[model samples]
Target: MRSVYPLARRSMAAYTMHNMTVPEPYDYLEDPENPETKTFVNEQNAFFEEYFASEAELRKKIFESISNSQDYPRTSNPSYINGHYYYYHNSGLQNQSVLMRAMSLTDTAPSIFLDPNSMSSDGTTALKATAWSEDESMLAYSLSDKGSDWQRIHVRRADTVEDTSDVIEWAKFTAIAWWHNLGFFYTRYPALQGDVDKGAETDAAQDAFICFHRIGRPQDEDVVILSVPEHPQWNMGASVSDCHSYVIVVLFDGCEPHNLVWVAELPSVEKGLGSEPLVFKKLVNEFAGRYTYLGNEGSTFYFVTTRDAPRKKIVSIDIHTGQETVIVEQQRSVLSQAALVKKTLLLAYLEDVKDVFYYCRLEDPTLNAIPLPIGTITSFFSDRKKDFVSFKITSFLLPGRSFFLDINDPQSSLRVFKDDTVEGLLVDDFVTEQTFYNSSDGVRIPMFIVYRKGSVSSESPLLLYGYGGFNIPLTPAFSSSRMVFLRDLGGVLAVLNIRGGGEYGEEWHDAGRRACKQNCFTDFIEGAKFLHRQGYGSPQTTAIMGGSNGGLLVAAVANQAPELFRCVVCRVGVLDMYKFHKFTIGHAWKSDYGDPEKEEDFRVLQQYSPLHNIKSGIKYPAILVVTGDHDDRVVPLHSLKYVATLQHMNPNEGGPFLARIEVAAGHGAGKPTSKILREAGDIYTFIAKNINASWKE
Candidate 1:
């Protein structure tokens, strides 16, 4: 049903393409150091550089606007650990936020605890995740270099900030769990068999194991607690039971979200023998929908599972008796997460991509809605033992503000915790509204459009962004660059809540993945058409943007309906769906994107693989494909291969096929503030230039 872009001029390079659909022996393209590969990348860089330099002044202006708009005091939600308040603090223009702790949440004089900016001169080394010991005497944190997924774990005294000799390496996708303050449990993959590339190790992830790390010991002394040698393809991660009584290892195959949960009883910690691994009991051995371990009461374990309810529900199962009882039945909205605090279950539901919190008593199961400021919950933090929680909320036009809630007190009220507003920017000056449009299949899709008040017309340049995969929802959040677009460029920014997301629940997500994946593209294309019909803009003035899965969306949509968009931004996208499952953790995504090795899935994937469906002579949109060399999640080759194939097709056609590859950046997480600002400037400037959007304040 899709037009196939036949073979382009062949090179006597290391690999060959057989049928354009069957790209066998092309794995050699993964070798980034190959002279042929380097030369190819060099040419693409030069091409993009020449084009970008031509628009340097425009980019500088956009950069200034975004920087000015972004200058504000920002901080993360406060977390209570060991009776102390811990949170990250950042003043305006700081490259990294400093971790700080206070005696109380309302304490005005919190002391700077850990400043990551002091660790590295360039501010590229970022603190990724942190976990505290039960007594709060120790802090175990992970740091990432140049935004890579590979993290280095460090242990330090929480009160004194004194470093310990404990250091764990070769870790990725690990969750650190403190075991009664004696030691911790974390996951790590075996050391690589070959030399690591310039941060690009394209090898398939394998042999990951959960280990127990004793405090005050070298990493080599860490003992492996869990490894399935029988199932080499399986990936394992360990998290302490909510009670901190056992180590729960979540086992999965590839990117499959379904998992088998196993738990090992934490031995008596008084003997200092915590480093010894205990025999694990298979609690839930079925590979069904996610059975997230919430907490447990001795033998009874609570979990939020979709095994019985596709929209998800809470259930309590006796580990010893195998007796299961439904605690919270599935409702209209999807149950995203549930936490237990003082016999109360705090449930967060995703209602049309908006967050709604409900508190339910486990004994009587009475549900009471908690009032939150009407906006997206951008960040949240709460300790299982504490009845208090903090979350940050923000809308498209509103700046982010953190709020504190204490459910224990009957007179408890939501109070402002932190107000991070950019100076000189008035929220009332802009307008944001939610509207629905019909998709190609007549399914109603929600979209939020924001612009300066009264800025509505077909002539307005529009930027539409979306991410419709992996059950992720597109929620409204304040963007400095977007505000700049509407305020200075006189444009409109819109976010599409399409299918393959948690917007409307599991049914909505199911309708847009696997064999139904085409619905996502149709939804987005019809959304573009709807905008034009509704007087947002024509194709000539419309631009589409998305990152990661959203990047894949924009690229696939641009190929399928190139004329519907004038510009596209593909950021770290998965282009060749046919082989995506072969790279680092790529096979895991096969749960949403079916395995292309199979005949049925291959037929579906080959029809939409962006890199394989490029056409020559057909006018394409102004394109900016972004990826980082250290991006092991989606890998840089997706963008590199797609750009090479695209440039081969339309060397000088409809619009320029440009690339912006980052040097020391992984998938997009942990990126430095400087890198973020630079990329935002380039992206908005490119969109403005392509749509003839002029900057006039």
Candidate 2:
């Protein structure tokens, strides 16, 4: 079985046949009027704009056709129960929300639970509801700040409107989670710590803690259940971006952080807290890095850890006994995420875990696994009254869908709720093929390609994207929005399952991280060269893109073989590898990317860092660097410093556009709809404007 996997490292090492460092930059005049260079960079962009509009129009026709035919599609975050289906979402066209029951296909009743004042300024659905339990009874939803920083969390009873408590509001306490009605848990960050400048005058921010308040507790007299007090900087949640990094951190200071956190009733002093201070684990580190709390069941806690694998991992810790065990041992090569069923677990996410969707029942301890469909599963829950499990899924083609998995005694089967609205779309005109192909080196690495037949081109301008860290797997579900626009552009688009990603398995990932990291870069180059040579595209028109680790790929590809790519897009990518680990939180990620502090690790990383490898004399392809000032993950300085460095060190054939732009948000976009349009326009415009015609722009 191992022999069957791709050897990207071996093949990538072989790809180092070219060693031309320091090539010539575009000596062509920077003057936009310079006809020779201008033809490729500037004039070409105008041609792209003219052609892109025509292409975009074609895609719009496709969107309109799909929208009309597959009208009224609904998706939701789900919950399971005794022979029933429950999920929630606001239908785009419905103009209001609906609490849907899957068992009944014909009618899904409007949910009684919702942010009471959910309407927008214009009476639109301004509230998005996300609940916390399988019963779907205790829900903590978000209220739109309408572009303001002060977003609020409103807790509602999903089961019925009978809960006598007035709608509970956490004004200063916005980030939240519903841990049963003992009350909801949310992040309480003091406003004073918002400034970096004040660092000089104040003691460090106390550990950010989760404050648990019972449903009946008066808002003013709520109990303070948990606080780090020491290293009080606890992140609200994980970064909501292409890469789900451990941007949020929680520390225990001296005592076990969780030890002081009691699961009690709100105002439990007068009422009753669930238990005394629980002792979870006495770890070697106290939230010194990116750690995530997966979920809790009774006294057990399942979470992603940096204990072994830096990018991501799974370890079970007993909050009551303080006993920790490796339910799934962490592997430096493979990244794993396991979701539990009763005591059974579904190793949900994996590095090179390329089987669209796979669920394994581990409760029996001896049962083998079976493959599930390729769909995204978020917030998994089982209804105590039924044999089904509920989950949320979204794809490049579909927005989001929820379903209940009916597990018979023999095996498990899935059914979208009868009211799932998953039917009726002009599902043709588009084809998504996911497979693993060998690089010139013989590694059977994963790669996916998509395109409308009418848009196919031989010298097809291809947009190839990838990320190789944190065992994150890229899945093909749905993307009507992007596809609608891409269809008109007329090009072959591809997503590479490069190493460092949970594509095939651990071995596939090992081929890309640390010393073998270059494998990701070349695996991509080979994929591009494969399609290019295979007639899907040509090196002269293929463009490579990736952010963060992917940014490493962008720089490596341009430096290694400019001949294979026409343009490069590195978004919020880390170009300078030297001092990266020193800033914001790079220190926490040293496990995935080797620590250069050690001489051996330093040389390995230097081999491919975007900034370090750029030679003085090499004339490379055109490139664009995107970053955000508010980006708390990969700081904008990484891009800015690199652009400034590359501006000098990076040798382009001419004055290629190497500019950086910061969106108002953080590591990820602040707004979804706006970001989608902006990123799409930027990308579509950039690709349409640059990839092939990038030089012209």
Candidate 3:
């Protein structure tokens, strides 16, 4: 047994907002380079390693099972861009996928265009986004290092596959739009002063600007096209129209489901976007509802909005006349996505959380449904100039499958582009059933349970996952770790679609955010109880898992009802709700989690904040707090302080609270395959060990 050292705590008055004083004992950990913080993190990591030393064999087996399940060549549906078909392929176990292109769909000799594995030896580098010029000669791509949100834009010649002299830095949460091969428009933040750790720093990001990068000019020479000088908290995205007639800019101050739209007419390619004052006409001056630009026809622009329709609808507005016309009214199902392809309007709807794809003519509103399986559409690719389109889907049992369609051909049905499968495993042996249960407030919640057919019982180990904030719905998706838990560890996987999600639309989200945030925790807690009552699993065999916003959910649930779970996995969670707005882009999350600066929001936030609400002497579950040292989004300080408090408050012999701090990783984006495998291996192993689950043949 490893000896445990008592952590020293220095009491400090952390905040005095709204005439309320808050005392924090671990505030010094917020600085990543603090001496005491470093020692504490190292000690916690050592304890975690010691605890898992005996489970090396089990972890190795789990890793191999996960690797074997993903050892097939996974390919994406090809997109007909310019004159070539572009797609991504990963010959299993590779750190990153390679972008490939071919002249025709039948051309088997697809040339390797760009391989991200060659960019970094350890695969920590990732290709973030790419945009091709209209002439198809140059390709502008962005690469992110060490899983950080910060990205660097690079230009490459399409034919030569050679990079150009252009390099744009300090780009974050941006979109790349080309201007008739003259240059491209991108978004970037002002340069930071002095040398700083880009990802590990916790300072707030402000004053983002939309700039135009010329092909041969340096980043300093890039023209500042648009900026909100009055609103430094606001961020903007720009996209050029398909006809190259106008540039549409969408600006948002926070993570609300709304934005402001501005349109600017593009001058001729010969004149270029001159440094002179460019005038922009405000189409939607207020952020009353979401206005997503679909496409444009001459001076008329199309958008999908939630205004006057909670489920969402399509509208067309003439920029010259400022007249808006409703094209497609809201249906019974929620309009999840829409695109304009070959002058045809294609829409994907979520009816009871299952995807239903449909297409209609621009002149005719009659909907023609496309037959798809009971799965979620993971990706969709289409272009206005091409009649061919493709989409990918996956479900609880299905790993991933792609299909293609030709809109012009009446006889053309959905054809299989690629069907991914696991080696030596029959997916048919597994089953998924969707069920609804009532929450503590009597609101119905949807939950998906997956397991070996007829293998679930009250004694089976169960892993429950949830994310009930940000208006993002939880849909059916494939995961190798989930499959391993079911097949190899004889466990059950449950995904709970609680409140605060867009499952039912904006109203559903409204019921679970801000002051209604407690409904999320109640819904999740009630989900666990309902499962136990239905004989899925008992409290002794239950494990809850979540990441990011979902991480906040599980942690809150664990604090509220510690007796309901045997293990809790919180990954890069937002724990310090009272002070969350002070770091990074957390202020933008005020829409879901109300701003802590206000007295009303502060009271609600402090009531259930994970770090603040830990009960002393309570026998909490075996908690595994996971966070990366360079996680700029949520910041490692949240996890560090959370685990420190949990260990300090409750020294129960039944619990062993631990933390696994990852190095050179961010908030779960662009993570290398090796890192993913290792993290999943450790997490699943910890869950199984805590729940006393035994691996099966």
Candidate 4:
């Protein structure tokens, strides 16, 4: 058999062909707004628009299949605030979900409070975050345009849903924390200046400050509560304590969840929300693991940390003694999150990349694990004082289903909150199985494969996906698009829980990043090999896909072992690792991807950086490079520059290089359902055509 496996490091050293060049005509595409770049984007989009013209019937069938599969009510777990239940509701084909409110979960008369689709003519505007005021009489929400991370905070009266003059700009990676409903704490960057494009700008995030925006005040009148201009790279975010007595400021240096923390006692309600000089005290001065603030009992504060525990545990830090006490011991499963629900410690653990809920009464040390259905917990929302909590669950073939639970009820069971089932999707027709595959380095990787029962064959087309960086776990979740691939296209889909992911704790993440970054690519290549050897699919019909950090994986593996995949979809990836850190928040990714500025790290990054390692004269797979013009997270140039170089070198190679640049879309989050469906339709159409995928009932 041919060697479609990825190369070893010793051999990868010989994989370089150095005289690669980007034609001068396409160099200007790096500048997103350049006239030539616009023309190039238009021409590329037009090319695909025409290239797929022959597949018009196939594209229509795929679009209709996905659209029909998505034709169901989509509802989020309702959060109980005051005497109301607030949640999101999107009926079939709605471009955006409407945030609605009602008196109770059983209420039939829920009124729309925020309709994001109405905010923009093209439905590009989206609500990013929302926070309820202390009294629940007001709401503070963040809105983003064209899917950019840059957000604008807006406040409105809860009772009347009337907008207030409170508008905060330059807010990115921020959360609104209410203080007695008088004002809120938020984080924001300095305003953009001349020559900065809100969506395509590749400037490093700098000078983040925590500000207090009082209701009824103009943006200019907002007070800067905390500013670290000396450390411009430090991203500072603050939130009010659940008891409304303390303000905790989280300091994050990079993309990693670990950070330092500073706390300050809130001024008495008698002294007013902004009275008395705020004196800050350092709680966790060092950037250790994550320290998330849970509810506190006066001077005794509770926080969940991975400090000395890689799997993570909950600890109490007494402000009086400045000493920490372990309240919850680390278990074998990775602690995903913890919070105080109704004065009870509620924890979510990742057991083999699946969510398991647990509750421990503060008065008793005993723990009780909640038995959830076989799936993933995508959302778990609860208040410290409320006994009623809600969560959403999903599996490979299942759409999201919301459930309500009462911790106080000894016989509490998962009560159906919202069974937003897809109308025609018979989930029983599919099966999801987990398999372990060994990587090139002999490390085992976890993978989830979903296919129609008894439909997968040795000749079946398979879509293998992975995102093995940034300590993020590739947990089980539902995807309508993937379902279309399985049911409509009769293809198999799999997601590898490879190294560099949090699936096996910090050690697994460490094993796949920095000097060990190639491990992720190797793990994925092994996953494809597993599928081939296990009779799941053939090497010639296998495709790879990932986005953002995962996107980097697809491209790197495609170049390293081109024969291993029939096609690849690298969406919004960091292609040119050499200059990646120089743009946007790319510098912030150094925690996972070591700084390329250093010589040692530069040597390591150069080995696998997709842009730097594209080998000429190789029969590369059918490649569809995608990026959004509004992707401030990874920027468009990464895809633009990388695709330009690929096409330049592989002019007569095995694959046709294609590019799809989204005009009004950002990274991926906050995208409209209509846009997501269309993108999926186009992508799957291309994949089906390239891999000879067929549809069957």
Candidate 5:
């Protein structure tokens, strides 16, 4: 077995990818002493500016061509049914209607959602909704801003067109799990004081807690139901670093050996504070790593665990009987998401190298192997009737779309919605797949690749995305712009589920953090090499992209193997990992990234941090460091200072690179239409400059 953590970790074993072959520690493909290695380095380095320059011109023209008319009910976050889309734009308390009369759904005109609430009072981020509910009665959505910790939730009743004004706490946490009948329940980590922005300290930080909130309350206040205290001191043992829970709120509170705090009673808010609390000895061992409590609908508590295997398994432990039994398992496949509704559980599990599905009853899930069609299910919804399930399916080729069916319907018999696909925008012709392959050490890591199949070439342009930090999961989500647009223009896109991601389980994450963290960078290297070795892309044509933790991934790879990439795009990246956790946002991450205060953790981190790794040597790629001055999440300074330093320090073939910061936007969003147009135009400019396209000519 290949050491998942190429460094010392509590003895553990798990495959890195299919057939396992942990990559030989990263090799220097670009060296000042080797002329051949630097041959194409210059061409690659020269592509980005031109790429970005071209995109800028095209964007300018696109934006310039448009005329804002007072008659057009300017709308954003639109929804399309048979053909027409009902869209509108919001500007904080003020909103404007979006009337396109008709959209070609092709090359004629590309639409952008202009939420007036895109930015906060601080003008850092903007809150926006993706869609309104099926009944069009209420709007269930998320708000992203540059200064906020994570997205906020909202429930807007559709009855009053002017009442987009009354918003409710539709969900909790950064991630959302919404059940039509129950509303939305997301996770929460009140550690607003610590380094929650950066993916650092992930150990038990404070007594981090989880709670659920609803809208209809006469007094709309988030129910302060569950919370785990923070570390006794700012820096100590077992402090809850920060949190982003999709499901599974590890209900615990204590010191070193964190004790179980309480289990949440969700079904009815009417139960009020009468919910029961489960302490340690009564539950299991105290502090047995981070454990998550899956969705608790009624009397059942369903969750996935690696009880007896390296790969996590889906096990349902009845809350009433305390009976734990494994219902889903595979040699290396792990189950991460499980939803319970009306006794039937919709389990989203992984089968080693690919995405798989299992639907069964929470009461009896003894049998498994029930698979749904291949596609990344962004999310699923179960209605009050409990007879039907609605799924949101998306991919590079397909924009976000919705479909529904009865529990017994395998064909997904009903397609209720379709997104931006028309004549020239052929979607079915696009080719993409999630594959599992051997890593240097024999562990099977899941790798996803997108291309036009036979139309692909070893010399084609490709971009690899990776975020191997903070126990984050690189679950399937649709990005129509990146995948479909790029592929159609002859390019490839890929997402790598490297070590630090929780998709596989806790151990899988442990394998790439701190000292073992170098593995994350190498995993990215392996991903790029895979595309090259398989003749899908080459170093001279491949590009790298990631944001925040992902930004760090691409930066690290850029330093380690500059020759392996033609262009590098780091969005709000963490270049100086050494001082990261020290930043306002970085402070909350000691548990995830290990407190740099300690000599041991610092030594471990210094090796791979993109900032520390940079030296006055090697050929560098054409870099486009993008960030928003309003970005409070990862801090734009990371990208700002890094770009400044790279320009002054790099003497390679490509002088330096570009840094396009959007002033109106923050970490993520909540901005006006003008701000959005400018940002999109800049992005397109960056891409055009790099690919050497005749973009705006």
Candidate 6:
């Protein structure tokens, strides 16, 4: 039996901007809190629920499969800070990981320093960032609710584990940096006026500034450290030097890889930073390339930069002489991460999409390689005063492995700190392999394929995932949902290392953004074709999934090559590229996606805009557009309008074009365990049902 879906009423309205006219029918849905908009969202939610309820048994089995695979104790790599070791731990499916602290590294039992689960009944409130005072007597931390980017910082007494009367609000995309024990620096925007659904509001974020907060003071009394009133689009990030001598401020206008740097000498502890403003010296005056502060030796500062080097390199600049010299020359691979631990410079490079670790002395240019398996470094932490470094590595088959290393020991090796395991899952039962295929333009792209030991067949169900924008690389990582698809549904997983990512550095990113953005779509489409040609799966048995920028990828590809995929899962995507810059933080994406206000960029954007490109009288792939009602990053309007238009175009021909509007959730961060499991169950069941896939075990 066919189910009847709600049809949104169309009231066409023409909008003229940049000398171009666009007719929008469902623009009213942009107001997420409007009565009509809420009705539409609720109707769509009900439709999705009805569809899932029909497959109750299948959904239950899939949920159990994902839950079992993730139900295991996991611990993060421990950090030794000021005579105490700190790490996060989760005891099998906790809503949020608890922050744990111990007096010694070998202590069998550690006390919970902070538990996010207790902050909210549903675990929607999450810990975001943390910083310790110089004396280690106070801890400043930030928390976000309902997965919104906006964070509120609070202070706590380390010894007593009691809350202080200090609180800082309106912070987003911020960094917490402490300056001695007096106070700390952070970034925040002006407070919003009137009543507004903060997470669902579409106002553009602007006038971001750096401010310093003193202990036991109201937020209104915080001191503004830096403000660029001339450029409201600019956002600032601040960090205090390891020696506590200077404060470094990084200024960025958008999501571009380049930024400007400013340095200010900190006032003495006795003198203190008064209400008066401090003079800042322009270190790097131009936003030429990325400059990351590694560490400093007196007035000489070390940085990892991409200036004149697409693959990035380490350079040192003497503030006294104002001269810069290359400390480490650019290598063949991209320098992914670099940190100064004590006197040694630890570096991690992406060699063919896998992490390769190396280290060198501060005074020596000779690089010494550290032996590590082919995997990605998910997290890394180190301190200059400490001789040890901790990091976690994970691959497609392995959940995670935490390791600790002592840089001072000549015979030191990566010591296993924790080995994560999944219930009823064995490492030997699965296989992962890397393969390369040429795109339509003859560019060779790499992909990782994972499946059960004997599940390679031409008719096997396959899932292909990709994210190719913002210079973010799609490295190897573990996901219980993906594992459930591979293990319980007898499917194949393929992670495509398409262009527009930092996998090959800035050059690769350049090849797939702005005017060349079509390369990303072409690369992803060709990847699907390559997998099909290799007999991994048939076009009728394949599914494509992506989120955010990658959400744009799958949607555009589904419009361009609908015959290559059986199902499409677009999660919190930026579909309407024409008006994306008008929303929250959307203006920053113009660095990758060109500004729509310009005629030239407008023509290019309109050519690939997902909502505008949907054709009539075509049987498009079965699409399940997923989004959060509270999502402020990409905004829920993109998904809402896209789904409405898709349904309007193909009223009766195409497969189920459904929408899942998750309530009280923002973009994907800090989501509770229950929400994750439920969403995974629905998504996987939708794909499995459409592709005729059955549970194997």
lDDT of 3: 0.79
Candidate 3: RMSD over Cα atoms? 8.1
Q: Report the lDDT tens digits of candidate 1 across residue range 442-508.
A: 7677888887778567777888888877866767777787777777787888898778876775677
**Tens digits of per-residue lDDT for model 2, 1-697:** 1112111111111112124232223323222244553233333244334444656663344434334433454656555443444556655555555554555434445434443334445443345534454334565555545434345434445446443454434233245544433555555545524555546343333455555555666766554445555544543321111111101223343332232222222222243553543342343343443455554555555666655455455676664467667755544333333455544555545334332334444455433444444435544565323455656655454455565565543244665552334343333455555667887589686666766655566655777877767666665555543454344455556787777866644555676777777666776777776776667766665676777777767777775676556777888777667656767777777767766677778767767766556566656666777665555677555564455445544334432544536334244535555454445455545555565431111
In candidate 5, residue 602 scores what lDDT?
Answer: 68
Model 5: residues with Cα > 4 Å off, grouped in runs: 1-56, 59-346, 350-355, 359-373, 378-390, 406-424, 594-597, 636-638, 663-670, 692-697
Model 5, span 394-504: residue lDDT tens: 555565555555566444455543354422445656666778867757777777776664776665666677776777776665543464235334666777887876765
* Whole-structure CA lDDT of model 5: 0.52
lDDT score at residue 303, model 6, on the 0-100 scale: 89
Model 5 poorest 10 in a row by lDDT: 236-245
Q: Residue 235 in model 5: shift from native, Å? A: 29
Candidate 4 structure lDDT? 0.75
Once superposed on the true structure, which residue ranges of model 2 sit more than 4 Å away at CA? 1-74, 81-85, 93-112, 115-326, 330-338, 353-363, 383-386, 409-412, 418-433, 440-444, 451-463, 466-482, 485-492, 498-523, 532-697
Every model's TM-score: 0.65, 0.58, 0.66, 0.66, 0.57, 0.66
lDDT of each: 0.74, 0.52, 0.79, 0.75, 0.52, 0.79
1 against 4, candidate with superior lDDT: 4
When sorted by TM-score, best at the front, the candidate numbers are: 3, 6, 4, 1, 2, 5
**Mind giving the per-residue lDDT tens digits that candidate 3 earns over 1-697?**
3455557476774667667666677778888888888888888888888788999788888878787775777888788877788998888767778898999878868988888777555666677878877787877778777655544445557779887777767776668988787788888776542256445373546777888888786657767788789997877889998878677788887788877789987666777667753688877888788888888888778899888776788888888878667899988887767888766888888887888888888677788887677678888887777787889888877788888888875236688777776775677678776788877878667788787788767788888888766878778887788878877878878888878887876788888888877767877887788888888778876788888898888888876688667888989888788668888788888888877778778778878888778877666778888888876777788888888887777675446787988865354578667887888888988898888787886
At residue 364, candidate 2 shows an lDDT of 50
Error of 6 at 408 (Å): 7.2
Better of 1 and 2 by TM-score: 1
Give the local distance difference test score of model 6.
0.79
Model 2 / residue 81 / CA error / Å: 4.8
TM-score of 2: 0.58
